[PDB]
Amino acid sequence: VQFLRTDDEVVLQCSATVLKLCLAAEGFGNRLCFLEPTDLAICCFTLEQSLSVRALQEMLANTGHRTLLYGHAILLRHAHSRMYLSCLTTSRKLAFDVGLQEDATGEACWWTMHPASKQRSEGEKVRVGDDLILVSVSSERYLHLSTLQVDASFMQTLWNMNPI
Asked: Residues in domain MIR?
């Protein structure tokens, strides 16, 4: 059993139905995320920061290797493009597009981590392989696999953060 910490390079995976899907994006003209079945250049995200919502709110108002905790908000940096995973405003239904944002400002590039069940709880450490929920701070929608795309909708999808 391993714990996740900021500065860790990870890939975000979920299951469609049956092989797994990795959240991905190019970042050099195209900012929309897509799915990659299982490379790294498009799948690797760095866990830049992990803050409590309060800290997050304070940092915004006034504009190391820390272990992730459920309830905390994380900032995901696309290692290749150097941009940030964010909840976009566009859409092409009741779900928003997900993708890269050049600057790491605003609430769109922050996501809070939540337990899939009671086996984890707000405040506990997030383990590698844990099934978790990702909620967009700016939209309050979940990182979701729409059925084959990735979006932020009212419907949840479980994800895993696995180190490369």
From this structure: 65-116, 123-164
